[PDB]
């Protein structure tokens, strides 16, 4: 197997930690959801290629501009997360996270991932957002931002239901394999 490195980035509310936890365990924990993610080395076989995908999180590093880039060296694929119940997390993707990722990871494929896709049809979520003249991120709005920032592709998932989770990581493996 070949060794590939993945790093997930995005605002604190983007759900990056939950996504890494649910994929590494193949489960949304029934008893306790961990606060933090240490690291993990996933055994993945995509399109007949066997890969060891090392997973890394940047949660906790958001306010530390000199500690944070120490997670980037030799990254092969970047997952750039935002939350579908948070239009403000999407607006931060182009002029905050994108310039940083392109500088420390030049020529590294970026996959823009819309998380919490199950909250797009949630009534409590729609009621709360409507109070600040807002609504859940639309499918076309995610594609457009991914297109605009030069992302390799755009995907959606729900850490809660597991839907779309395996596909994101298999596609990241494929992106990490390309030259």
């Amino acid at each position: 197997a070949i060794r590939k490195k993945l790093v997930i980035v995005g605002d604190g509310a983007c759900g990056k930690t939950c996504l890494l936890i649910v994929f590494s365990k193949d489960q949304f924990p029934e008893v306790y959801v961990p606060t933090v993610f240490e690291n993990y080395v996933a055994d993945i076989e995509v399109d007949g290629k066997q890969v060891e995908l090392a997973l890394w999180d940047t949660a906790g590093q958001e306010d530390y501009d000199r500690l944070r880039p120490l997670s980037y060296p030799d990254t092969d694929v970047i997952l750039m997360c935002f939350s579908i119940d948070s239009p403000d997390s999407l607006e931060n993707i182009p002029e905050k996270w994108t310039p940083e990722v392109k500088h420390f990871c030049p020529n590294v494929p970026i996959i823009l991932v819309g998380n919490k896709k199950d909250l797009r049809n949630d009534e409590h979520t729609r009621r709360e957002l409507a109070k600040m003249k807002q609504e859940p991120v639309k499918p076309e709005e995610g594609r457009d931002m991914a297109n605009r920032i030069g992302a390799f592709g755009y995907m959606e998932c729900s850490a809660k239901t597991k839907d779309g989770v395996r596909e994101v990581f298999e596609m990241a493996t494929r992106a990490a394999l390309q030259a």
């Binding site: 008893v31 933090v36 240490e38 906790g60 000199r66 500690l67 120490l70």
Partner: protein, 245 residues
């Protein structure tokens, strides 16, 4: 890690570690607080263990089996002895607090009601100055350690055979040289996330909510200080490139 502590922290949560009949006697809010306290200790046990792989398995193994130039092993594993001391002492204090709290006749049923004071002591005074000084030095030597590792693995045959040999067992899957280095750098930024969630379930005793609030502010100041003390060192750097930063 030692078998005793591994078994005590083998469960995914505190609610699964204690006996069902003990768990049943507590309120939901207590269980929630104890699950986050358990995770902080369980991850501290893992952090110390990461540092023992670096000092005993990697560093000492290279000294006793390889012929490396003086200052190479130090360059690969900066501050590992100081870091191990800081975290083994902190883990000692956390584990003693759980031990004191055990019910008679039990090696697993406990409730930690006073974590705040221990956290204020760890992140204040001389021990805080030592953590700040040690991580400012470690994180500034992080990129140099990775580049030096990569250079050695690709050019030295016995170093490559050594790495492949000591990293072959399954329990070392996520613990290679570079993985240990990033694990250690990421550790400090995990503390405010764990402490804030503990504080979220520690409103029952006002003195405890206050101590946890103080501890959170202390951790953030330590982090802000470490972050301002970082400048990546580079093998064979020129003075001109440094003063034109």
């Amino acid at each position: 890690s030692m078998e005793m502590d591994e078994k005590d922290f083998a469960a995914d949560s505190w609610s699964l570690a204690v006996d069902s009949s003990f768990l049943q006697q507590h309120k939901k809010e207590v269980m929630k607080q104890q699950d986050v306290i358990y995770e902080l200790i369980q991850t501290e046990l893992h952090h110390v263990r990461t540092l023992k792989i670096m000092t005993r398995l990697f560093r000492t193994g290279m000294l006793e089996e390889l012929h490396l130039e003086p200052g190479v092993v130090q360059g690969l594993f900066p501050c590992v002895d100081e870091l191990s001391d800081i975290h083994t002492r902190f883990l000692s204090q956390l584990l003693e607090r759980r031990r004191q709290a055990l019910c008679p006749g039990s090696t697993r049923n406990f409730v930690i009601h006073r974590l705040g004071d221990l956290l204020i002591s760890q992140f204040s005074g001389p021990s805080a100055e030592q953590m700040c000084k040690t991580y400012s030095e470690f994180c500034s030597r992080h990129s140099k350690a990775l580049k030096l590792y990569k250079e050695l693995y690709a050019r030295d045959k016995r170093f490559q055979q050594f790495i492949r040999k000591v990293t072959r067992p399954a329990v070392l899957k996520r613990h290679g040289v570079q993985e240990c280095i990033l694990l250690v750098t990421q550790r400090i930024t995990k503390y405010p996330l764990l402490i804030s969630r503990i504080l979220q379930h520690s409103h029952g005793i006002e003195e405890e909510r206050q101590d946890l609030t103080t501890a959170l502010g202390l951790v953030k100041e330590l982090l802000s200080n470490v972050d301002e003390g970082i400048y990546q060192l580079e093998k064979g750097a020129r003075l001109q490139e440094i003063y034109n930063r």
